[PDB]
């Protein structure tokens, strides 16, 4: 009867560990550590309406100050049971979306990365464009492409809304009958993989798409 389909929740679980794991190293106090522990514990707890014995046991391990990376690995691997990874679209499905893009091919990603990524966006340094493919709420494959600046600066991307090496994703609207359109570029993290692991909320990414057109 165990069934859940929310990649964002799984990503969020591993993301809240940052305010805690970092505190286990940067914070030279014990009270602040306990405060963050309470947050992290409640954060994951609020997700699982019905926590099981193992989930509770795993949460108990997270409460330990000596939370090694191996302990986390075991816990994360156990949480994967309540979720599902991403899927790589076949050439026929890809060409079905990118009908105007001939000779297009998705790079071979890693299995681990495909378990923590909700959207695949690779950059092509041929014409300076990034191709982003994902799945919407209707379980349909949707993909788009936009120009990228030949420079890597630091900024706040609209997607994960964090701080990392970013760039620009320029996209134009659908050209009307007159041949007119509107241009709209936004800041995007160059490495979509590193950005995927920073996806606090999928709605943040969905909002970005809502701003692209």
């Amino acid at each position: 009867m165990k069934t859940m389909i929310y990649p964002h929740q799984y990503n969020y679980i591993r993301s809240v560990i940052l305010r805690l794991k970092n505190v286990y190293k940067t914070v030279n106090d014990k009270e602040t550590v306990k405060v963050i522990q309470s947050e992290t514990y409640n954060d994951i707890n609020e997700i699982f309406g019905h926590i099981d014995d193992d989930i509770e046991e795993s949460l108990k391990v997270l409460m330990n100050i000596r939370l090694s990376n191996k302990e986390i690995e075991a816990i994360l691997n156990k949480f994967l049971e309540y979720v599902v990874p991403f899927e790589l679209p076949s050439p026929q499905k890809l060409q079905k979306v990118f009908k105007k893009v001939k000779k297009i091919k998705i790079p071979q990603f890693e299995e681990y990365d495909l378990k923590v990524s909700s959207f695949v966006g690779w950059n092509e340094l041929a014409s300076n464009r990034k191709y982003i493919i994902y799945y919407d709420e209707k379980k349909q494959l949707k993909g788009l492409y936009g120009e990228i600046s030949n420079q890597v600066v630091k900024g706040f991307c609209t997607i994960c809304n964090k701080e990392s090496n970013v760039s620009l994703f320029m996209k134009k609207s659908k050209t009307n009958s007159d041949g007119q359109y509107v241009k709209k570029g936004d800041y995007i993290c160059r490495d979509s993989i590193h950005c995927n692991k920073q996806l606090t909320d999928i709605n943040q990414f969905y909002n970005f798409i809502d701003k692209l057109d």
Binding site: D29, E31, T32, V35, K154, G155, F156, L168, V182, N207
Partner: protein, 292 residues
């Protein structure tokens, strides 16, 4: 046995802003002295990252810093840096006509600009008219307009980058000189300043305060003395999460004072909150430096 040590990166964060200038100046002379290493001012978790071959090579470098440049820094530290700028919308006129070198030069353009600091921006639209006729001639002028722009303004930051629309222009047939075009951009930027009103800069940044309680009257007072606006304030055992926000990104001495005030038991996290303006004093400082 040999020591297989290739490239190693070390962070060398300075003490104050004076040391920052010293470091920047040091990087210049040092890189010219020995081009066998690299130094960058970006990274993900640092201020000044230096990378070279061999750990001994690194020691020689840090030695020069404190011994020759007398810069106070700490090897192996984390840090960050930002700076935002944009506000208002309007239509700017750009005209440049001169003849100070035998040949004549003329530039006439009409552009409209709008803000887009929401999660960041960066866009220059083209209307396929004005100084362009052919279809494949539109990306040329649009990219060219940004080339000059990046030479007068700053691009590539948290919540920045303008969104303009090229809707008109007049060129006819004249000579194109870089210096003449670059100086023209500066002139138009000046004309737009008094018209569009350039303020706001860095918006309101929310900061979650975390530190032991029992000093509510002291802690809160120190926060208000930093122009902090408190939204939440819930305790947890001995400490308390004071969900606040201060219109200022980064940590311009904020961490230094906080560290001392909490004895090294106080932390926070900055995040974009709302479209507001930074401290008038700091805002006018950077706007003055940018015009100096």
């Amino acid at each position: 046995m040999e020591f297989p040590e290739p490239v190693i990166h070390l962070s060398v964060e300075p003490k104050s802003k004076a040391d920052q200038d010293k470091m920047t100046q040091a990087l210049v002379k040092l890189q010219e002295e020995d081009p066998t290493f690299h130094a960058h001012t970006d990274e993900e978790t640092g201020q000044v990252i230096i990378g070279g071959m061999g750990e001994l090579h690194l020691d020689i470098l840090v030695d020069r810093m404190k011994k020759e440049f007398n810069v106070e820094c700490n090897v192996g530290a984390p840090m960050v840096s930002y700076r935002e700028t944009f506000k208002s919308s309007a239509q700017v006129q750009g005209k440049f006509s001169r003849q100070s070198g035998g040949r004549g030069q003329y530039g006439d353009v009409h552009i409209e600009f709008t803000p887009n600091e929401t999660g960041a921006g960066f866009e220059f639209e083209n209307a396929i008219v004005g100084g362009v006729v052919p279809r494949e001639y539109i990306p040329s002028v649009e990219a060219g307009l940004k080339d000059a722009m990046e030479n007068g303004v700053l691009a590539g930051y948290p919540l920045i980058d303008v969104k303009a629309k090229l809707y008109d222009g007049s060129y006819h047939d004249v000579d194109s000189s870089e210096m003449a075009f670059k100086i023209a951009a500066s002139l138009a930027l000046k004309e737009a300043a008094k018209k569009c009103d350039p303020v706001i800069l860095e918006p309101m940044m929310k900061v979650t305060i975390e530190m032991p309680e029992e000093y509510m009257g002291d802690i809160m007072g120190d926060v208000t003395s930093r122009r902090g606006r408190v939204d939440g304030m819930e305790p947890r055992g001995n400490a308390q999460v004071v969900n606040a926000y201060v219109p200022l990104s980064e940590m311009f001495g904020y961490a230094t004072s906080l560290r001392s005030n909490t004895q090294g038991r106080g932390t926070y996290t900055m995040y974009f909150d709302h479209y507001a303006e930074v401290p008038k004093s700091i805002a006018e400082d950077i706007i003055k430096k940018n015009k100096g």
